[PDB]
């Protein structure tokens, strides 16, 4: 034993779905009301999951980005991916297929650890039903979790679930 296990997590999805708000709620216990578009930012947190101490290295990505060799390079180093849409934005849900294809291409694999995240569950303007998102996740063989970065519903669960998926794949 030379130190805690490290997990490299990448958060992807369309512009404005709440990738940064989810990550800042996890790290700082703070809700960000402002919309400041991301290029690329990285965070670390030590947590205990299923009795194992580990270090989460989290990469928060841009939601609007043309083809970039530099974006492919950091995605290749990711071990697992949170694929985020907003439950009030149907286009962000339709964009999930494109994120999943991008990940499979860069990792050269059909079997990459991933969790589908439906964020902004606190808002009254739902356009994507729970059953539709659950059906999509079942079709991919991955978990689905509903979150709110404002209330904190599901935030720890999304990240911890992704770690559990990475552990299953290693074993
Ligand atoms: N009501 C509510 N608002 C949210 C939630 N998550 C994010 N928001 C709001 O949505 C806006 C965009 O959030 P942000 O985290 O910056 O989105 P992003 O996916 O990181 N955008 P980008 O891809 O440009 O970096 C902000 O005004 C933020 O407060 C949520 O769960 N509920
Ligand atoms: C230290 C400077 C570089 N950073 C920036 C921020 N860090 C800091 O501690 C910090 C504190 N003050 C300012 N920065 C933690 C961060 C650790 C980290 C996160 C993510 C990844 C990753 C995940 C997926 C794919 C590829 C890579 C790999 C590593 C990091 O190493
Ligand atoms: Mg962001």
Numbering used by the authors: -2 to 168
Q: Paper's wording?
A:
When KRAS is bound to GDP, the protein is in the inactive state and becomes activated by nucleotide exchange from GDP to GTP. Mutant RAS proteins remain in the active state and hydrolyze GTP at a much slower rate than wild-type (WT) RAS.
We determined the RAS-binding sites of PPIN-1 and PPIN-2 by soaking KRAS169Q61H crystals. Crystals of KRAS soaked with PPIN-1 diffracted to 1.63 Å. Good electron density was observed for the ligand in one chain of the asymmetric unit (chain A, in which the switch regions are stabilized due to additional interactions on the opposite face with residues Arg102 and Lys101 from chain B in a neighboring asymmetric unit) and located adjacent to the C-terminal end of the switch I and switch II regions in pocket I. PPIN-1 primarily contacts KRAS169Q61H with the biphenyl head group via van der Waals interactions. No hydrogen bonds are formed with the protein. Our data show that PPIN-1 and PPIN-2 bind to KRAS at the same pocket I as several previously identified compounds, but they do not disrupt RAS function. We have screened a chemical library that yielded two RAS-binding compounds (the PPINs) and have shown, by crystallography, that they bind to pocket I near to the effector binding sites.
